[PDB]
Amino acid sequence: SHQNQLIPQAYISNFHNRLTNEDDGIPIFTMQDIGNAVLPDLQDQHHNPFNILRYPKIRDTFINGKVVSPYRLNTDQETKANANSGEAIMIPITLDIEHMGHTIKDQFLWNYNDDSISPEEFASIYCKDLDMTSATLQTQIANIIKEQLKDLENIAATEIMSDLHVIINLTCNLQDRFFEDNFQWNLNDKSLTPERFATSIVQDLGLTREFIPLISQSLHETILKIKKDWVDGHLIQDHVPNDAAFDIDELGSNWCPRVEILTK
Amino acid sequence: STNWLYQHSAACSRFNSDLFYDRVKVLLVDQQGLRDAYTNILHIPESTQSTTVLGWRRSKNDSPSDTSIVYETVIHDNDLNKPKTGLSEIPKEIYEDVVDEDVLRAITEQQNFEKCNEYI
Amino acid sequence: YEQEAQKLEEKALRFLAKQTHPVIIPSFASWFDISKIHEIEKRSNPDFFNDSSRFKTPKAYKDTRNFIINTYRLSPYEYLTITAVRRNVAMDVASIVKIHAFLEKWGLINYQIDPRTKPSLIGPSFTGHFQVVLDTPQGLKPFLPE
Amino acid sequence: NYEQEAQKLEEKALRFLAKQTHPVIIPSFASWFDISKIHEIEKRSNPDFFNDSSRFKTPKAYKDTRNFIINTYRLSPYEYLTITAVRRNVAMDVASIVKIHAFLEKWGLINYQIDPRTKPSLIGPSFTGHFQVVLDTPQGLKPFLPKEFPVNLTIKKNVYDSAQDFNALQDESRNSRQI
Amino acid sequence: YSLANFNVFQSLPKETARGVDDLTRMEMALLSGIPEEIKWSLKKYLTYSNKAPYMISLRTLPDLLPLFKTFILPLERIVEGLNKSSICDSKAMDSLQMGLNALLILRNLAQDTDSVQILVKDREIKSFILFILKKFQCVATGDNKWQLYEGNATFFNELTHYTLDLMEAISSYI
């Protein structure tokens, strides 16, 4: 109960070492008694934090950890009568970067219509998290983000007004697991967003949370591509292959999603 | 040839059962939860966890000057027999004017039941 | 000619019904008719009757609805998810999700099921019952309501 | 009958309940916060999720994201909870993730850095009683029933003699004759 | 004995060991809306304005005046409603006292050049000063429109004084 027995709060950070390890498979930046339990989150330690060290992962966090100074963002000085409240310009962004003896493969979304944060700030945050601070890396990241923003900018801001139904094949690989699915998507109804779709898929298949962004993000990609083919007129609308019984819109229609671990 | 719909439907049900069994095997039977490495934290299906907190409750000790604190958690399940649905969300301007009196009373009962189950 | 196709479909659906389990429809859904629409669907689910596209038609809507209801009633003790229906139905995923959520709201799809069979995301646990401690300008004080 | 039902329900609820080990400390001005509700301060500081401007920004999405972040921090309050981990787990646009993370960090709700071994402990006015935090029953654990059935179970209990014992999370069980 | 006895915990800075710098604490407390935090922060701000006004000058710390204005304008409404018994509740008394404290803080800061320069460029504060002065004139000339209820005189008294001091300062800039 003594003052000294307490533990400081929010100083350590073992994130980079969890990135580097191979036992912890992170697809980015690579080169009583305990049963089959790994973390103490559900097993009650008898009001003694020392027992927390029975688990190798907590020990790794407490031994190979660094002390981290917090982010100090711009205190969210929002704007003066800005943010005209357009819906969204959601464009995906990928990163393939070869640092010295290090790879970086990553993906995320970016709202082009929101000018609250700048690519340089995101690059600084990312490099601080990876613990690889170097102005050259941040400049590369910012330039890549700006290029990918300028490319897909005008295309994403094109609202479709005529009903289009397209057969879509999603294929996403995390590190070694491949998720493949086929379905029929309507590019006019703003009811369902790819995020809700990905959440439903992950719930039903029982996958990890890490698949929720990935899938959705990749979905966004395909949509944009289709939009290009519909701006250039190269997109036909006469037929769509869905296995329908005899008219259209019937009860066979397609296959289903699957997740497979592959090699070679 | 009157057996096609039934076969597709039965295949759907078998697929559903397979998915359920696979989820139960992976998430809850083999190991209790999946340890994610980004945050170094367990992940268990949200169903097993509780959602919200329905206020608090407070009382007194048995004797005065008995300066002790009894902290304890409690779950509350008003009418565990009747399940909850999204019926507390449908606006009145939809089901009204086309309904039987009894169905209207049932709708009102269900909505009030959910709203009251959101309380302590 | 088309009357014969209607006869075929009717006999198929009759066989489906003749090989389905008996279920307990809740009272607040008694307005439902397997062979009708009842104008509650028309209001709750528009755009199946505005002739918006060649695809979303009231006939296909009714067919999908009946198919989903029967696929559930084949085994009422299990939550019917969207992936299976999506596997065996031709329509935009948005409309499938609309119909699924609609039929769920009125207790027509997942009213009495084994609650262990409902899928849910895997987030971290729920730390709502935890004990918090305020940091007053003087000292650490146990946060407790009044 | 129902006795065994409630017994199994208590067993299952206690098995899948998050056991607290470390104490959480937040500054006093962050006392308006509730994990299950949204406050006016959150709606003023985040007007985009509630002004009905976009479809990707709904109050449900904001609440789910912030609850994910809060739970993740509370489960291991000694680490720092970098933004990249959250971004890898959550499926929002990076700008919104950053805004929510910064907002939660400003009010000390997460990443509140102290060294709690340099401050005294006091006693508030509200004290010396039985406190029952009543949380909703989890689904997927309710019994399978193929008359009413209310439930007011009690899962786990903890007793403390002083406020310092409450802060240090030291129960009378082990504290009695520790060494 | 304690997990704090790791080498990793041997390099902590002295700036965070307390948790939050008191300026940030007072600002966030005013931002919250909890009455206890409001009163604590207002007492501390008043002490600082009296014994160290260079640390909270309205120039080095922008967006400080808006909070005081949020505490001061309801004071205008109350003073308009001050010609009858209208402080029956404790929330009314608390709002009145918060307004008086914010007004005294503003006056103490206005005793400096930069702070009064920032105060002059504000239509709200000048309009409030004019409103209080017109109420004082109505009391002085003995008008039958608005007659101060003597049960409140005390409050009004303090009010008037602060206002005049403010006027004095801004009198150089009009």
CB burial of A30-44 (b: ≥16 within 10 Å; e: otherwise) equals eeeeeeebbbbbbbe
Six-digit token string for A190 = 């703003």
Cβ–Cβ of D115/E20 closer than 8 Å?
Answer: no
**Dmax (CA) of chain C:** 88
- The rounded distance, in Å, linking the Cα atoms of A118 and A107 is 17
**Cβ <8 Å between E1 and A5:** yes
According to the entry, how was the structure determined? cryo-EM
E32, D32: Cβ pair inside 8 Å?
A: yes
- Mind telling me how many Å the CA of E25 is from chain C's nearest CA? 9
**Letter for the amino acid at C94?**
A
Do residues E17 and D115 make contact, with C-beta atoms less than 8 angstroms apart? yes
Tokens of D102: 């910064």
The CA–CA distances, whole Å, from C114 to A178, A202, B67, C99 equal: 31, 20, 46, 22
Helix (H), strand (E) at residue E108:
helix E90-110
Q: What angle do CA A72, A73, A76 make, to 5 degrees?
A: 135
By Cβ distance, the residue of D21, D84, D167 closest to A45 is D21
* Chain C residues whose beta carbon lies within 8 Å of the beta carbon of residue D36: 128
Cα torsion at C1, C3, C4, C6 (round to 10°)? 140
Structure tokens that stand for B97 in this block? 């004017």
Coil/strand/helix, residue D23 = coil
- Alpha-carbon distance of A183 to A243, in angstroms, equals 11
Instruction: Give the Cα separation of A5 and A12 in Å (integer).
Output: 18
> Which residue among D75, D95, D170 sits closest to A111, beta carbon to beta carbon?
D95
In angstroms, the CA E127 to CA A69 distance is: 46
Residues of B in contact with D73 (CB under 8 A): none
Residues C16 and C69 sit within 8 Å (Cβ to Cβ): no
Interface size B-C, in CB pairs within 8 Å, comes to 133
Radius of gyration for chain C, computed over Cα atoms and rounded to the nearest angstrom = 23
Tell me if D140 sits within 8 A of C113, measured CB to CB. no
CA distance C88 to B8: 7
Query: Which residues in A163-193 are b (16+ Cβ under 10 Å) and which e?
Result: bbbbebebebebeebebebbbbbbbbbeebb
Q: How far is CA D63 from CA A116, B52, C25, D35, D50, in A?
A: 20, 12, 34, 9, 11
Report the distance separating Cα A33 and Cα D16, nearest Å: 17
Q: Which of residues 112-141 of C touch B (CB under 8 A)?
A: 112, 115-126, 128-129, 131
Helix (H) or strand (E) holding A247: none
User: What is the DSSP annotation of C47-116?
Assistant: TSSS--SSS--HHHHHHHHHHHHHHHHT-TTS---HHHHHHT--S-HHHHHHHHHHHHHTTSSSSS--GG
Chain A to chain E, count of Cβ pairs less than 8 Å apart?
32
| Gap between the Cα atoms of A12 and A6, Å rounded | 15
Residue with tokens 């709002």: E95
Whose CA is closest to E32, among D141, D98, D33, A47? D33
| CB-neighbour burial class of residue A216 (10 A; exposed 0-12, middle 13-18, buried 19+) | buried
DSSP string, chain B: -TTHHHHHHHHHHHHHHHHHHHHHIIIIIISSSEEETTTTEEEEETTTS---EEEEEE---SSTT---EEEEEEEE-TTTTSPP-GGGTS-HHHHTTSS-HHHHHHHHHHHHHHHHHT--
Domain range spanning residue B86? 1-120
Tokens describing residue A87: 């819906």
Do residues B20 and B13 make contact, with C-beta atoms less than 8 angstroms apart?
no
Q: Within chain C, how many helices (H) and strands (E) appear?
A: 5, 3
Token look-up 């985040």 returns D46
Q: Is D132 on the interface with B (CB under 8 A)?
A: yes
Contact E4 A6 (CB under 8 A): yes
Which chains does chain A touch, 3 or more C-beta pairs < 8 A?
B, C, D, E
Cβ <8 Å between C115 and D142: yes
**Resolution of the model in angstroms:** 20.0
Domain count, chain B: 1
- C-alpha span between A178 and E17 (Å, rounded): 48
